[PDB]
Amino acid sequence: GIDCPKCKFSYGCMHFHCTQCRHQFCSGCYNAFYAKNKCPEPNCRVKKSLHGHHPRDCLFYLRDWTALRLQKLLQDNNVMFNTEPPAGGCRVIEQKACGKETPAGYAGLCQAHYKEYLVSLINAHSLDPATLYEVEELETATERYLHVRPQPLAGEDPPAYQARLLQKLTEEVPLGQSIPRR
Ligand SMILES: COc1ccccc1C(=O)CCc1ccccc1C(=O)O
Ligand SMILES: [Zn+2]
Ligand SMILES: [Zn+2]
Ligand SMILES: [Zn+2]
Ligand SMILES: [Zn+2]
């Protein structure tokens, strides 16, 4: 299940409570959640919201991708993923079974739980979503994680600019370090 990164107790919303230690954290990347006015991070722009600071491969972000784009990341890396239901209506047990509609090609899960499954594979294989980023996404990631505003250099054509952004991001900003890897 999910372990409190603080106490280590084992168990579509990312905000998780551990009742033992009262830690607030993200169930996708295990980074801490902060209530409004409680965030200590100097370069964070969100000071009046309940939030955490997530790596680019947290489900917090990747849940907003389409299933098709999540599949594309897996396909580009030749990681297999299920599309068909199991041998014998979403079975995933939620805290209120999920019971939602089970679309064709979504492996017998609802849309949200199928994306969670794809992200679980993406994370297991340490696939980097930045490899599919358009330049706008690379610029956003640069601002978010490197705290600088990117801009192309004189003499840099568009492919070179995009490649530079991608190279600096991947070299200097690790994927989530508390996300479980295989
Ligand atoms: C799926 O749930 C959400 C998705 C996007 C934004 C907000 C929510 C929620 O209100 C529930 C989950 C949640 C609660 C508090 C803080 C963050 C989140 C979250 O998952 O983003
Ligand atoms: Zn705990
Ligand atoms: Zn997260
Ligand atoms: Zn913050
Ligand atoms: Zn479901």
Residue numbers in the entry: 868 to 878, 884 to 960, 968 to 975, 985 to 1070
Paper text:
The ubiquitin system, composed of ubiquitin-activating enzyme (E1), ubiquitin-conjugating enzyme (E2), and ubiquitin ligase (E3), regulates numerous cellular functions through the generation of various ubiquitin chains in a system referred to as the ubiquitin code. The linear ubiquitin chain functions as a scaffold to recruit other IκB kinase (IKK) molecules, and the recruited IKK molecules are then activated by a trans-phosphorylation mechanism, leading to the activation of the NF-κB signaling pathway.
We identified a thiol-reactive, α,β-unsaturated carbonyl-containing chemical compound, named HOIPIN-1 from HOIP inhibitor-1, as a LUBAC inhibitor. In the presence of HOIPIN-1, the molecular mass of the truncated HOIP increased by 263. This suggested that HOIPIN-1 stoichiometrically binds to HOIP. HOIPINs are covalently attached to the catalytic Cys885 of HOIP via Michael addition. The benzoate moiety of HOIPINs is the key element for binding to HOIP. The carboxyl group of the benzoate hydrogen bonds with Arg935, and the aromatic ring of the benzoate hydrophobically interacts with Phe905, Leu922, and the aliphatic portion of His887. The aromatic ring of the methoxyphenyl moiety of HOIPIN-1 and the 2,6-difluorophenyl moiety of HOIPIN-8 stack on the carboxyl group of the benzoate moiety and the guanidino group of Arg935, respectively. The HOIPIN-1- and HOIPIN-8-bound structures of HOIP explain the differences in the inhibition activities of the eight HOIP inhibitors with petit-LUBAC.
